[PDB]
Design a protein around this ligand. Sequence first.
Ligand SMILES: O=C(CCCOc1cccc(Br)c1)N[C@H]1CCSC1=O
Ligand SMILES: O=C(CCCOc1cccc(Br)c1)N[C@H]1CCSC1=O
Lengths: 236, 236
Amino acid sequence: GFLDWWEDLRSEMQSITDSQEVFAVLEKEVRRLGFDYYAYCVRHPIPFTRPRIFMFGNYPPAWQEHYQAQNYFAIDPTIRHCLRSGNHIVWSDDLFADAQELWDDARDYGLRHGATHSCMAPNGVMGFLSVARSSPAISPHEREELRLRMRCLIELLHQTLTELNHPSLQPQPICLSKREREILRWTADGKTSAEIAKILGISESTVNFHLKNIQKKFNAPNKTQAAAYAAALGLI
Amino acid sequence: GFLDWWEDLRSEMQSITDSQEVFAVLEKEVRRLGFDYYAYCVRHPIPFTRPRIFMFGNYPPAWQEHYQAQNYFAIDPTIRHCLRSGNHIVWSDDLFADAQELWDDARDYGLRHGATHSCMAPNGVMGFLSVARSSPAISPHEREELRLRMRCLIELLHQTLTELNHPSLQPQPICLSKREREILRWTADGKTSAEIAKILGISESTVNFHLKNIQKKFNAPNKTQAAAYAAALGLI
Ligand SMILES: O=C(CCCOc1cccc(Br)c1)N[C@H]1CCSC1=O
Ligand SMILES: O=C(CCCOc1cccc(Br)c1)N[C@H]1CCSC1=O
């Protein structure tokens, strides 16, 4: 049954040593779900205007090249940084209402039925797992089991790739002290250096010294970027 | 049959129309897992220094009031906003190495074995589900199934309470324009008002006009808070 399937896949993936074999197992499991193609996307939260995005999968190469040529990542709703009930969305005309050209084109490449499941690690990194096929529409009776299996797949995928330290997952490596973490929290809450100095019982000079060190660790021009980047990375 | 249990529980929860009944079902499912008590905690990401937290559960009231009196929420490792390797942690002496008074007290109240699962909505809200009991240690053979069941429980719990519009899951609404949003995004990436005026081809007066409005929407005294709040809420 389901638990048998899950335990066998855990064992199969726990025995992996190279990232290449992870996606090979994934490809097999996606076909077992009844789909021809899958994609995996890692969206880091920063920079806010041009977020680091890593993309993987086995879509027909002709579709990859077209998706890239048309810059569809910038409008694709399936990888939007947004809230979806159940972290799951079955593809539909409504879903692409504001991305009509992408949906028009994708169906012309045979990607006519599918779903995307998403997860978000507490470090701002979001994963998206898509499955797609040309013909059978997704049946209502298979929808909920598909969501459950996809959730299991994307969780095991993300965990396995993190444990092999795949470059895609390693987020901006920042290390903040307890003191400067606390100063940045008050800063992100809108306090000035003077207020923070009174709150912590230290000199305004010491606060600014810490803010300067924080800004350098973020390579930021000002405290606004540092506080926003720390929030998005889950550091405060 | 794991799948029938899930489908049975979904139907049960979907028939719920009062939040009280949701926790009643949850309490029964936690006993079915073999535990005496549960807690459910909703952690909003802001204010960074004093986050909006809602707590539910059926821990003995004597423990509830002791936990609150001691402010253990602030140091509790099970509800820390951090990256749990599987969104799941079984309680251990190691986990509480930095919170020894909490763990000593908890065991003195009979909370000696348990686990916490976590989920993060992509709007910064984090859910935590704990189960606890006094006697049998969690055995190696039941761990992976407990993880899976707890993940299903917290996901269904969060979904059901969301669709009932429970006030704990409702975040304070910020209605940001398409223009306000891109100005705040650039600002979070460290750009100045003068710079932003060049990117959008408008006056620096007009940028600060939007920023003063954005700041009002966040009830924020500066743009640093507006940007960090927008980031943590998933709004930019
Ligand atoms: O599955 C996704 C998420 C984006 C990742 O897809 C891609 C696109 C190009 C190369 C690679 Br590899 C993966 N988007 C869907 C929406 C409908 S058609 C499509 O590609
Ligand atoms: O489960 C958690 C985190 C959530 C605590 O939730 C609580 C605490 C007090 C009253 C209520 Br209601 C819920 N902490 C554990 C650590 C070991 S004992 C304990 O409470």
